[PDB]
C-alpha cells in the first residue's frame, strides 16, 4: 500500500500546463524520503511544512499536479505570483501549503522541437487550482468571432518552442506540485510511522 509518487514523477510524458495533470493520492503509506534525498531536482520549495517531517504525519488526501513549463516561469509556481502561467494556466493560492518540485528536462522534452502548450489570452485570472481547457477563439473586440481566427480574434493557446540549444531559461522544466488536504474526515495518507 505504497503511495504512487513514481508514476507521477517518472512519467515518460508530461501534460501541458494549460491542461495540467492531477493525481489523487489516498489510502496509502507515503515515503517522502525518496523525494527530498534525491539530487535530480533544480528547485524544491515547500511552504508551511517541511518534507522531512511529513514522514510522521497524516492527511485526508494528497494531490500531485504535474506539467511542463519553461525555466523562466518556474518562479511563478508559488503563492502570491503573477504572470501568464500563474494568471491563466496554473494558480496556487496565497495560503498554499505543500511543495513545488521542478527539474530540467531538456534531454526529454526537446527535439529538433516541441509539443507543449500554454494559454496566452484570458479575460480574467484563474481561481486557485482552476483548470481551463477551452480552445474557444478569444474575442478581443466588440464583434463576435463565430469560431474563425482573424482580426481581434485570437487562438488562446500557444506552443512552447522547446529546442535543445536554447538557453536554460527557455528550456523545458517538469514541475510537480504536492498539496496536502486536511478536512476533518478519516486521514488516509500517512508517513511510514
Amino acid at each position, epitope marked *: 500500500n505504497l503511495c504512487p509518487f513514481g508514476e507521477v514523477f517518472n512519467a515518460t510524458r508530461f501534460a501541458s500546463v494549460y491542461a495540467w495533470n492531477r493525481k489523487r493520492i489516498s489510502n496509502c503509506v507515503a515515503d517522502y524520503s525518496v523525494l*527530498y*534525498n534525491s*539530487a535530480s*531536482f*533544480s*528547485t*524544491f*520549495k*515547500c*511552504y*508551511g*511544512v*517541511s*518534507p*522531512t*517531517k511529513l514522514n510522521d504525519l497524516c492527511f485526508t488526501n494528497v494531490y500531485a499536479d504535474s506539467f511542463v513549463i519553461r525555466g523562466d516561469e*518556474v*518562479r511563478q509556481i508559488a503563492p502570491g505570483q503573477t504572470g501568464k502561467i500563474a494568471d491563466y494556466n496554473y494558480k496556487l493560492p496565497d*495560503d498554499f*501549503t505543500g*511543495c513545488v518540485i521542478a527539474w530540467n528536462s531538456n534531454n526529454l522534452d526537446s527535439k529538433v522541437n516541441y509539443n507543449y502548450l500554454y494559454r496566452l489570452f484570458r479575460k480574467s485570472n484563474l481561481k486557485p487550482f482552476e483548470r481551463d481547457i477551452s480552445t474557444e477563439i478569444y474575442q478581443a473586440g466588440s464583434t463576435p468571432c463565430n469560431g474563425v481566427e482573424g482580426f481581434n480574434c485570437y487562438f488562446p493557446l500557444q506552443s512552447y518552442g522547446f529546442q535543445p540549444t536554447n538557453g536554460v531559461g527557455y528550456q523545458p522544466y517538469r514541475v510537480v506540485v504536492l498539496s*496536502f488536504e*486536511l478536512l476533518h474526515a478519516p486521514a488516509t495518507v500517512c508517513g511510514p510511522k
Partner: antibody
Amino acid sequence: QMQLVQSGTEVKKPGESLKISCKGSGYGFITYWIGWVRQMPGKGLEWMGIIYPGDSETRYSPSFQGQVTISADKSINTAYLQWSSLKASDTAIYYCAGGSGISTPMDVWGQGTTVTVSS
Amino acid sequence: DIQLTQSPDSLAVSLGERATINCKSSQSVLYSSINKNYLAWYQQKPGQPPKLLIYWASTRESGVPDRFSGSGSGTDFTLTISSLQAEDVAVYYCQQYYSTPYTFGQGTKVEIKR
C-alpha cells in the same frame, strides 16, 4: 541529514566592507531555506532575513532591509551575508540557520561567525 | 509584524524540579487549515549555537529527551522541563515561523538553583 559550516572570525575597521559565507553539505540541501540570525554580545537573537539558494528568493526583515545584502552561490551550496560599510554597532556573532521550507523551524545551525568592528 | 514576549527573563530551578517558561504572541499563530501552531522552542548553551528543541509548539525534534514538553496554543505557549538536569542550563528562546519576517522571543536564562 545535512550540516552548515560558516566562515572564520572577522576583525574589521569601521567603514570597510565585509562578506561572510555559509556552506551547506549533505542530503536534502535542495529543500533548505537559509536564514541569518544576529546575536550582539550578551543579548538575544535577531532574525535578519532568509534566502532560497535555488532561485535566490530573498526576504529581509524590516529592521535590516537596506542595511545588509543576503545572496547565494547555488553551484557551491553557499549563502552569503555582506555589508558594504561596517559600523562599530555591527560587532556581533552571526549564525546561519536552515529550515526545510519557508514557515518551518530552523533544524540546522552553523557554528557562528564572530565579527568585531573597531577602530 | 508578530511579536513574542517571554516570561520570566530569568529562572532558577533546583536539580530534578520542574522549569516553566511562557511565551505570549502578539497575534495568533495557528493555521487552522492544518490545525498546527507555527511556534518553535530553541535552546542555546554558553558559547554554542541555538539548537531546535520543539516545533509546532508541542512536537519534539529528534534526539531531544522526553523531559522537554511544549504546550499551549493560539497566543499563549509554554515550554516545560520535567526534572531539570545540570546540562539544561541555557537560554531558551521562542520563535514564530507563521509568516515572514520570523521573530524571536527575548530569551529566558535558566540556571541551577542551589
